[PDB]
From a paper:
The γ-subunit bears the catalytic activity and consists of an N-terminal kinase domain (KD) and a C-terminal regulatory domain (CRD).
To investigate the mechanism of Ca2+-induced activation of PhK, we analyzed the cryo-EM structure of PhK in the presence of Ca2+. When compared to the inactive state structure, the most notable difference is that the KD–αJ region of the γ-subunit and calmodulin were no longer visible. The majority of the AID can still be clearly observed, which remain tightly bound to the α-subunit, except for residues 360–365 that harbor the Lys361γ–Gly362γ autoinhibitory sites. The KD was likely detached from the α-subunit–AID platform as a result of this conformational change, providing an explanation for its absence in the density map. Importantly, the separation of KD from AID would lead to kinase de-inhibition and activation. However, in the presence of Ca2+, KD was not pulled down by the α-subunit after TEV cleavage, and only AID remained associated with the α-subunit.
Numbering used by the authors:
A (entry chain A): 3 to 154, 158 to 212, 231 to 359, 363 to 622, 758 to 771, 778 to 794, 796 to 967, 1051 to 1221
B (entry chain C): 329 to 359, 366 to 382
Write the structure that this text describes.
């Protein structure tokens, strides 16, 4: 090997020694960022040791002589030393890991910088924005990979598992990002970056799959966009490619790479993100933050980082390629010291040449500044060279086969065991043909609720010596409660979450349980990427039987018979005894569980209750609010009979009553924070009340269950029977996004109050009735019937007045056209802003929002979609797009903030005159008591000579006539 | 020219094609595709 491969290996040894290993501290093993930046970043240290690890691996695959063994051992032990030093850096902050485990706050996060001479902390928590889930996640990922490569106390194992819990909730934790500045605006605003989420997913996979697939949901929803305030980040290459490989969608990976190439790639590398301005000649060097008005200034002149082209060589090596264009384009290396490449950190447009670069993008000869060499980039450069020259293989750097993520994974067959709670239930199930086994017969396998599984993991990770307290109580979804568990040598199987949660009306409806089971199976068939085959334990309880008790629910039978047939829930299902499923299951072993009016005196007014059960309940709110857990003077309290009333109406299944009792007793869904976190996990915002704006409190970020529940209560303003609707509809939307997320495309802000109003309207026109009696029959809907209404609301299925209904359906669902937000970005260039109901969407937003941001989307949907009425909004949507339509033909720009409502109205006044003349009944046109827009205008089709969009075209042209006196149109 | 958009946006062809395309982008999820088209004033419509 020394003939022609040992000399080149020694050349790379000199490269790594003179670029990386020269700066490693003999005391700590950490690497200072540069001469000026003497501190050691976690992520930079982890990335900078990749070259050393790869060299050691190279040296070892050819280590036969001693000297070669000495070099390989030195390199491998340098890598081990660096990782151990970073460990004591994190170990010294065990009080921060423990605090972030429960309260994921930026003030309780691990520091990014550490003293390279003492493994201590250099700055204060307040001083750097230390929350960077990607640094800890990349450390965990490469700790898993290096160990799987043969690189070697239990206390640090407990600390590492507590770090697993630390980065476990990264799909819902705002971050300061890989660039440790949060959002682009650069005001220290913690933001959810897909880079951190993907790195956390990779670290967890290499090292509980529920939060792993939550991170997967974040990745699918966010890509190709980076985060809320970023169209694209070149750091996404660290997720869709080396080192995370956290995206298993090949199309998504290709789309993200193409977005990076098209938007950020330049002559001297790739810009980190659009309007970055980290080392641009336009920033203020001594000012830490960025004013929202200078972000425009950074456009088209952002610094291009050669570091990202090392990622483009790494993929290309990991995935075989002729991307030998990414190499050969890195001739932009500083010294050819002696001849050391010295990959720069970034290239900045020379200051004088700002105007030329702005105008002519990616064309000016930039200068190198920042760190030189960028050790994070230099290590990746050396690793890619090693890998590309045949001295290394993807399987040596990646012994965990993270690269095989993109390969299509086959559908999984979910084995289900239907277990009888009681033997009588088993007898009924058999009369009907499903042969099952009782929970007693399944012994020695012990069936437990998922609550017990969540509590068991709270004893994982605990060392009281360093004050680490297990894992926080997290709800285990279907993914967690589908593996079999080896606890104290006896196998424990756990039923899904939705079965033991019988505290809200959803569990009483057997159809709901069928629907929850179907959603769980659909989620399992797609998200199970685990060794073994998942096993859903489905016990048929006594509540699952019919009214008589000698027969089983039809819906539950039908579901079980379909599962026996192999298909239910979009999933192939194998039913059988739980004993048969031991050999082909994810039988994980939990080793931590081994031991070792008048008359205001309310003296006698409840006497009227002593049989309609509606009236009995009605009195009971007078006697609750006026008199909830107070006495009744008959060995009874207000709460007690309300619970008795709740049980009675559950037995009679008159759903309006159950909902009301639930509503005034403040029944709350336990897995509701999970529903909100799932809906927000898919990059969909939520608003909770009736539509006028203050009541409708928006949910932009995840909220803890107490807050979420409290936000729901205050959004009803005391008006009952909607606070429960918000939770129930949120749950249904979560299930439908888990199962049929295509239904939720072109939707970005779910207005629950508008949804409820549109369900009431649909119950009013279907089963024609008054809108009000329909608002009351919506109460009397079964939970599964209401879920069906929501399906039909979403998919627009029907059980001269049509176009008003559509305009309503789409507006309530807040459905926007494809490309609508980017089109709004275009008009804001022309006009000075849009005004809806007096609220202004200024053009200054575009000076800090790139068109494809999901932060500009929110800005638009907060000025436009806030309109209470469902249709008025869909018309305001048209008037914007006809404004977008006519902006292209118009050659000039106007200095007015255009009031879209007026264009809607001017079209309204243009609707009376034209229709009256074409000759239509004056009473045929009817104004709206809420919007002042003729009902027939809503009923009008979009296109045509009398189409509503044509009227707005005749309105916008007659609107901008006084603003634009002259209009040399194209 | 503006006057044409004000008077008869539809006849002028280039604009109509745009109007009809915008109708679909927004509302082709509801799709003869004619439902998205209204060439009768509701009176000649509600005549039968
Ligand atoms: C050529 C004139 C029209 C086609 C009338 C409709 C256009 C406008 C009223 C102005 C559009 C320009 C913006 C910046 C919104």
């Amino acid at each position: 090997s020394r003939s022609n491969s040992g000399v080149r290996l020694d050349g790379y040894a000199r490269l790594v020694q003179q670029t990386i290993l020269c700066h490693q501290n003999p005391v700590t093993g950490l690497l200072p960022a540069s001469y000026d930046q003497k501190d050691a970043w976690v992520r930079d240290n982890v990335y900078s040791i990749l070259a050393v690890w790869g060299l050691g691996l190279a040296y070892r695959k050819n280590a036969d002589r001693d000297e070669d063994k000495a070099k390989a051992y030195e390199l491998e032990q340098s890598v081990v030393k660096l990782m151990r030093g970073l460990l004591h850096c994190m170990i010294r902050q065990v009080d921060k890991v423990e605090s972030f485990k429960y309260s994921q706050s930026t003030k309780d996060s691990l520091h990014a910088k550490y003293n390279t001479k003492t493994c201590a902390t250099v700055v204060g928590d307040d001083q750097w924005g230390h929350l960077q889930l990607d640094a800890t996640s990349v450390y965990l990922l490469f700790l898993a990979q290096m160990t799987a490569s043969g690189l070697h106390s239990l206390d640090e194992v407990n600390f590492i598992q507590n770090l697993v819990f630390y980065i476990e909730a990264a799909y819902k934790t705002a971050d300061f990002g890989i660039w440790e500045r949060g959002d682009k605006t650069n005001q220290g605003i913690s933001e959810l970056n897909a880079s951190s989420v993907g790195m956390a997913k990779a670290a967890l996979e290499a090292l509980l799959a529920d939060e792993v697939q939550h991170c997967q949901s974040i990745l699918n929803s966010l890509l190709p966009r980076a985060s809320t305030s970023k169209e694209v980040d070149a750091s996404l290459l660290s997720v869709v490619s080396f080192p995370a490989f956290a995206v298993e969608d090949s199309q998504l990976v290709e789309l993200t790479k193409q977005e990076i190439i098209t938007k950020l790639q330049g002559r001297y590398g790739c810009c980190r993100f659009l309007r970055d301005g980290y080392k641009t000649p336009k920033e203020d060097p001594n000012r830490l933050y960025y004013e929202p008005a200078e972000l425009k200034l950074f456009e088209n002149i952002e610094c291009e980082w050669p570091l990202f082209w090392t990622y483009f060589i790494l993929d290309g090596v990991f995935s075989g390629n002729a991307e030998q264009v990414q190499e050969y384009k890195e001739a932009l290396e500083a010294v050819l010291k002696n001849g050391v490449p010295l990959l720069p950190e970034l290239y900045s447009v020379p200051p004088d040449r700002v105007d030329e670069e702005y105008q002519n993008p990616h064309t000016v000869d930039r200068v190198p500044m920042g760190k030189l060499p960028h050790m994070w980039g230099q290590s990746l450069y050396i690793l890619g060279s090693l890998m590309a020259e045949g001295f290394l293989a993807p399987g040596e750097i990646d012994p965990l086969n993270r690269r095989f993520s993109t390969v299509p994974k086959p559908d999984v067959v979910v084995q289900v065991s239907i277990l009888a709670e009681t033997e009588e239930i088993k007898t009924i199930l058999k009369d009907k043909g499903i042969y099952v086994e009782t929970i007693a017969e399944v012994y020695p396998i012990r069936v437990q609720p998922a609550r017990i599984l969540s509590h068991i993991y709270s004893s994982l990770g605990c060392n009281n010596r360093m004050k680490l307290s297990g894992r926080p109580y997290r709800h285990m979804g279907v993914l967690g409660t589908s593996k079999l568990y080896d606890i104290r040598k006896t196998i424990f199987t756990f039923t899904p979450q939705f079965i033991d949660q019988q505290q809200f009306y959803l569990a009483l409806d057997n159809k709901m349980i069928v629907e929850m089971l179907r959603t769980d199976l659909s989620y399992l068939c797609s998200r199970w990427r685990m060794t073994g085959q998942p096993t859903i334990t489905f016990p048929i309880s006594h509540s699952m039987l019919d009214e008589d008790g000698t027969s089983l629910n039809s819906s539950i039978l039908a579901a079980l018979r379909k599962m026996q047939d192999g298909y239910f829930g979009g999933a192939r299902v194998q039913t059988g005894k739980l004993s048969e499923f031991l050999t082909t299951s994810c039988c994980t072993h939990l080793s931590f569980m081994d031991p070792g009016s008048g008359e205001v005196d309310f003296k006698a007014l409840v006497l009227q209750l002593k049989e309609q059960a509606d009236i009995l309940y009605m009195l009971y709110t007078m006697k609750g609010p006026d008199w909830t857990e107070l006495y009744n003077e008959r060995s009874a309290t207000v709460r007690e009979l309300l619970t008795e009333l709740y049980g009675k109406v559950g037995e009679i299944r008159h759903w309006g009553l159950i909902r009301y009792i639930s509503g005034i007793l403040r029944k709350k869904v336990e897995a509701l924070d999970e529903a909100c976190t799932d809906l927000l996990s898919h990059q969909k915002h939520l608003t909770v009340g009736l539509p006028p704006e203050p009541r409708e409190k928006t949910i932009s970020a995840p909220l803890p269950y107490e807050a979420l529940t409290q936000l729901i209560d205050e959004a009803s303003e005391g008006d009952m029977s909607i606070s429960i609707l918000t939770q129930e509809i949120m749950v249904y939307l979560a299930m439908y996004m888990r199962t049929q997320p295509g239904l939720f495309a072109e939707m970005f802000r779910l207005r629950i109050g508008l949804i409820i109003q549109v369900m009431a309207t649909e119950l009013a026109h279907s089963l024609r009735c008054s809108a009000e009696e329909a608002t009351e029959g919506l109460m009397n809907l079964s939970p599964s019937a209401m879920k069906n209404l929501l399906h039909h609301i979403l998919s627009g299925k029907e059980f001269q007045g049509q176009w008003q209904r559509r305009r309503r359906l789409d507006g309530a669902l807040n459905r926007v056209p494809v490309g609508f937000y980017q089109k709004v970005w275009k008009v804001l260039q022309k006009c000075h802003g849009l005004s809806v109901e007096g609220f202004v969407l200024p053009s200054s937003t575009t000076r800090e929002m790139t068109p494809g941001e999901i932060k500009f989307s929110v800005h638009v949907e907060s000025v436009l979609n806030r309109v209470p009425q469902p249709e008025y909004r869909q018309l305001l949507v048209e008037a914007i797009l006809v404004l977008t339509m006519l902006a292209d033909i118009e050659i000039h720009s106007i200095g007015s903030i255009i009031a879209v409502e007026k264009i809607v109205h001017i079209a309204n006044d243009l609707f009376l005159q034209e229709q009256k003349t074409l000759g239509a009944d004056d009473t045929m046109l009817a104004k709206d008591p809420a919007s002042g827009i003729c009902t027939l205008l809503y009923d009008s089709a979009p296109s045509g000579r009398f189409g509503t969009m044509t009227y707005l075209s005749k309105a916008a042209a007659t609107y901008v006539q006084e603003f634009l006196p002259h209009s040399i149109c194209a | 020219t503006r006057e044409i958009v004000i008077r008869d946006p539809y006849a002028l062809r280039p604009l109509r094609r745009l109007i009809d395309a915008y109708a679909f982008r927004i509302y082709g999820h509801w799709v003869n595709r004619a439902a998205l088209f209204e060439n009768t004033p509701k009176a000649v419509l509600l005549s039968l």
